[PDB]
Symmetry: C5
Subunit: 208 residues, 5 copies
């Protein structure tokens, strides 16, 4: 039997936050999904957008696991005590501003959910934002330093609505969100790195 | 008999800041209440507001308790030595800027009061800010990661006065502040998460 | 004979920066004085000012004391090794930007002087700033979490000119600086908290 | 046989982050190459530019090496656990804003690749930016404190296309990127310091 | 013989960074000299300037010394491991933005050179900036908390041109840099504090 204090103590003492939780030479499967909350600023001249999204991030780390047969089966853990995937947005032009407490939810089987609210600026196609078909801003996210044999990134499906959490008070409306996944070889390095491309189809609402 | 040094040493040494002070499998009851001090900027086109408020936050942590029959019965404690609720404003568009010393007041029975002055910008309904009925901006606050069996959130009880500490030098005036607690289920997760919705009814002076 | 290394070692090794240096039955007497250096921005529409001042802060901590019959009688100490009063400006709308090295001067009897240069923005009365009688901006400073029995705040007892070090290159000129102690209760808590109100009477130059 | 955990433990335990991995008194050869991603703001009046670039940095540190006959031959390491060259852009007018996770890739033979995305503002020649031949902004990068007997800086670009990773959505387009190795003695100090000058020839599209 | 690792270990283990390296009740002699790199913004209405300068700072700390008959005689050391003079500019209106790695160079006899590149804004006389005589902005630098028996501050000169490292792409040109030493008594305290005043004589380049 463990209480929350015991679980959290054991995790702090033994999770190796700098060690990717790879098992038998297989990639850590990371799921990412952006839930758009607001679009704060758009510039059709510069092709830049300022956006707030929840970055729902999910993966398994079995070194975190504990027998919860007589115990709580989930806890909140500061991310500084956990390994977290080194995800970056490749077309970000500002550093990610995390708006929320930096805590992940860890299940007793080792499943982790880290879902920060992030404000970040992007360079992307803003053309058509003012028309009915709208603009399509693509956001590319992947591990910065782990190639495909170490981290895979997936846009795991749901029925997950588009503007389920998007602000009704925004000047913009979301028409569609699609996720595409890619495998790229960069000039720097010989291995392929996976990314998810998130296409945000949106437009400016008219005053009426 | 303890002096302040002993109380604070004991809190610092046995601090478990990462551990939610859950007792008898009941949620930690957190009270929140926003005391509006200033509205610094409002944009009716973008529906954004920049606000300064004291986020009065209250809860009980029995692991902090000490016998105070012959001791001080209250101390100020760095929040880095305490568990603090992971509250977030859901419609915030900037990160909370804490303007005050990050100290909580702890009572010998384990009651904590943490009341930072916060500057933060929010996405909300700014329409009507210039009519007499004013605008109503809604701010939603709740635990980011603890569901309803772990953290409940409630309005601070004490009969809430609206303009109490609000700046007389602001360009805006407060007409009314109301609160409503909700219980919401999001698609990410199967459990319900509690929030308080704070409705700030305000208008431009003139 | 202690040398500076010994003094600073002893302070650092025994320092309890979390512990208010309450002397028996008494509030720690803190003296505060703002020496205005520059007024960088003024907005008469929003009633906001951006200011730079030296926050002269003085108090006694006898736990720091040492026998200096045959030793240096003063040293500079990082404030992270010292208890420091949790002062806040109640009408501040930005968090204090400290422009100087964060060192206090500690005398062998336990007297401490901490005098940071601070840039901060405030909400206050900017009306009349461009007139002959000028504007009067009031800045309210007090302990954020320590009530009247734990901290008292007074203006430094000197006659002194708080506009003495003000920049000659400023667009503004200071006409007068006055201070008044107040003591107030807040809805949150049953005790009185002390503050100093610093009234800065200033105007634009021609 | 070591697993990733062992490799990272061993590196962390013997991380000598402040020690330049000099061998027998001969300079650490550092390769630098800037991969331009975006040009965000250009001001022809002030001669200032705001740029985003991947700063591909490469060097060898044999103290990091491990036998990978039966082990992973590469790991990602927090740069806080590694010595990293003290490179600075001499004409930068803002501190480097690092946009990416601060991890370097370390090969079992001791080769290190650190490649942060950086946003930084520079002072340089913006004249002609809205002509056809374009502007040429020169960025000078070298070790801040290590002279030529301790750090050598070389452009290894490996010959990969200029506009390769540059945003197609930028307002600007890259015409050409060239590099020059320099060796400058400064008035302060008697030894020479190496730098690479990266010349970005770019324009506004039509 | 010590190697670099030994030197740095020994310094890390025994530097007392909060201890002023006073020897026998003498002041620590600190030399300061500003090498101007750029003038970014000037406002003649508000009397404010935004400047970039190398703040060349030099002093001796005998506790850092080591025998280098058969060892490297200089190392780079993080300033977090060293005592550094608590210098401040008295007319600065922003905090000193350090643009460079925060390393000092330490010689085996205990001489230290710390030379950060700093961007900072000042309140000073901007009048005359677009005439041929130019403006003269005075920058006052001294120890914040150490009086003259603990720290003296002294300007030092080289025969180099003041523009050696001034940007040729600035909108301003430097006409002259001079420096004065002062000893001032403030109201707070009974002791004299030393400062160096650095007078930057500059003007706007021809607009064409
Ligand atoms: C795959 N990353 C994305 C761009 C560069 C590359 C990389 C590789 C190794 C270390 N850092 C970055
Ligand atoms: C209640 N939170 C707000 C948005 C998602 C949710 C959540 C749940 C678990 C871990 N992180 C975030
Ligand atoms: C006197 N303080 C300033 C305003 C609220 C009050 C207070 C009391 C206890 C803890 N935090 C804040
Ligand atoms: C190469 N650096 C750039 C300018 C001065 C020089 C330097 C030398 C020693 C310590 N810091 C800086
Ligand atoms: C020399 N400094 C400049 C103004 C105040 C003074 C000072 C003295 C002691 C501690 N802090 C500041």
């Amino acid at each position: 039997e463990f209480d929350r204090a015991d679980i959290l103590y054991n995790i702090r003492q033994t999770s190796r936050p700098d060690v990717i939780p790879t098992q038998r030479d297989r990639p850590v499967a990371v799921s990412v999904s952006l839930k758009f909350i607001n679009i704060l600023e758009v510039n059709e001249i510069t092709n830049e957008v300022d956006v707030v999204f929840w970055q729902q991030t999910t993966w398994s780390d079995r070194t975190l696991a504990w027998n919860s047969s007589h115990s709580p089966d989930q806890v909140s853990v500061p991310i500084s005590s956990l390994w977290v995937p080194d995800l970056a947005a490749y077309n970000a032009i500002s550093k990610p501003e995390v708006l929320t407490p930096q805590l992940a939810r860890v299940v007793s089987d080792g499943e982790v959910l880290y879902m920060p609210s992030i404000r970040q600026r992007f360079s992307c196609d803003v053309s058509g934002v003012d028309t009915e078909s709208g603009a399509t801003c693509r956001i590319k996210i992947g591990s910065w330093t782990h190639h495909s044999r170490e981290i895979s990134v997936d846009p795991t499906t749901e029925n997950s609505d588009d503007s389920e959490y998007f602000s009704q008070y925004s000047r913009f409306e979301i028409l569609d969100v699609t996720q595409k996944k890619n495998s790229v070889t960069y000039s720097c390095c010989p291995e392929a790195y996976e990314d998810v491309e998130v296409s945000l189809n949106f437009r400016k609402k008219g005053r009426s």
